[PDB]
């Protein structure tokens, strides 16, 4: 057996956070369910880049409040993400906003240290989403439902 939903989620989230932090796209192709993962990653680029641009002042404010000191300093962010969902509401708008702020934190990490790693961050986001909303994600057909919910044109 295996946890393919976790694997696929971490790959999409890690890829987006890495390319956002480094400014360079990763060329090696994706693994299992590459079609969905590619479209999902493209959807995240289109939507998530817009969320960051359109809320950049609020995002900077949030960064200031969290005062993230290094690549391992993600416990408060984890608590925030759990808190976001603690009213019992789950939807793709909330999820893409958390991933978008993740990419914003990733760029921040690079400003304070060029050698900063993004894996601790991507894992903390992936953990909240996949572990605490596993069955919701499955019911929505995972990243296919993500692609379909935003239905970006000319992917």
């Amino acid at each position: 057996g295996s946890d393919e939903l976790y694997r696929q989620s971490l790959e999409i989230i890690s890829r987006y956070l890495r390319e956002q932090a480094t400014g360079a796209k990763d060329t090696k192709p994706m693994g299992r369910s590459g079609a969905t993962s590619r479209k999902a990653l493209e959807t995240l680029r289109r939507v998530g880049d817009g969320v960051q641009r359109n809320h950049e002042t609020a995002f900077q404010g949030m960064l200031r409040k969290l005062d993230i000191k290094n690549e391992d300093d993600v416990k408060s962010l984890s608590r925030v993400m759990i808190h976001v969902f603690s009213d019992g509401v789950t939807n793709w708008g909330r999820i893409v906003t958390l991933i978008s702020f993740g990419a914003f934190v990733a760029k921040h990490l690079k400003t304070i240290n060029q050698e900063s790693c993004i894996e601790p961050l991507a894992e903390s986001i992936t953990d909240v989403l996949v572990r605490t909303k596993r069955d919701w994600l499955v019911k929505q057909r995972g990243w296919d439902g993500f692609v379909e919910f935003f239905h970006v044109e000319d992917l």
Binding site: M62, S76, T97
Partner: peptide, 23 residues
């Protein structure tokens, strides 16, 4: 932590805004 709740409330508000727009 009071700051963590303010951040969560802000992310939730943005997230609902995006969800209402595509709903």
């Amino acid at each position: 932590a009071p700051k963590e709740k303010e951040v969560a409330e802000t992310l939730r508000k943005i997230g609902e805004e995006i969800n209402e727009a595509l709903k």
